[PDB]
Design a protein around this ligand. Sequence first.
Ligand SMILES: CNCc1ccc(-c2[nH]c3cc(F)cc4c3c2CCNC4=O)cc1
Length: 345
Amino acid sequence: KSKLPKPVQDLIKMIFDVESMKKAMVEYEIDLQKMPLGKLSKRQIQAAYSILSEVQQAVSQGSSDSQILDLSNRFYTLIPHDFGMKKPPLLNNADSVQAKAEMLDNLLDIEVAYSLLRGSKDPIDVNYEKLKTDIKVVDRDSEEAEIIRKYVKNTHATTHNAYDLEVIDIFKIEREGECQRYKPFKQLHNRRLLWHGSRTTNFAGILSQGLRIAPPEAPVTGYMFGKGIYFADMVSKSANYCHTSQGDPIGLILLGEVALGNMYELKHASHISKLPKGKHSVKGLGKTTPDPSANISLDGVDVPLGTGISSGVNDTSLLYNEYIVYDIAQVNLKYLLKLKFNFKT
Ligand SMILES: CNCc1ccc(-c2[nH]c3cc(F)cc4c3c2CCNC4=O)cc1
């Protein structure tokens, strides 16, 4: 009965895949009986973030093993885990705290996906409408597809040699309310078409609610430029955040129009609470940048699809550029790509 094109139906099945959600939770060693998908709650996850912030503070402060163990046990009480024969890993380093924070980020979007899914017509059409997003297939033979394929081909980083990328499908997307929300930023200068990678299990949340900023209660660990929305001009830097594997080599990646305006240019980590007055974004400066002479205009937006060349910058923490905005209204999502990851083994 569903009149949606086959590629769009396949996308809906992929994003609302309950088996992918359960597999993710098993990998995280979550107790699926004590915290089923339907029992995930914002208030409990909020409280879990706060505890992880206390753990992060305890670890860097060099607190006693007693107070670290206490906080570690409090986290596992809020978010039940099942380690089987193995005892529960002690949360006593920054990497472990960041891994649990990123698990919570993914769990929240899985909760959104499951709540939508269980919230006459073909089930595929019903679930499509719940995304509150217009999704159209971009024709393979179109100049539009040629530009996007070239962006993918040209901006694969030399140091990301674990996989090759193949574009399966290109979708043009329009989130309900996003045009009205973006309107004020639409006439800002320096609008750029940039990559945003995420786990497939996040995309129901991303399409229904848009790209969002980490809450205050989330720990600061791994936010190089503070709590904002991060984008790449190199497809492979973003593609890495799809967290695809040989077992599941199909990923989803966004092209967003980002209203960057006056960029605060940084070479090193700075946890931005407030931009300098007159700045609209941060650019992390990479050693390698898309060749600016190959910059193209797609529907009034700059597409940096040039091959990676040396920037001017040797004295930087970053191999590749990154772009951060601190207002959700500065992003207009344009395309969603289904990518095949061909791992080299
Ligand atoms: C949430 N834990 C800390 C954290 C995790 C991931 C990111 C991040 N940095 C990026 C740079 C970039 F150029 C592109 C991306 C990211 C991300 C994740 C979002 N997606 C990206 O493509 C930033 C902070």
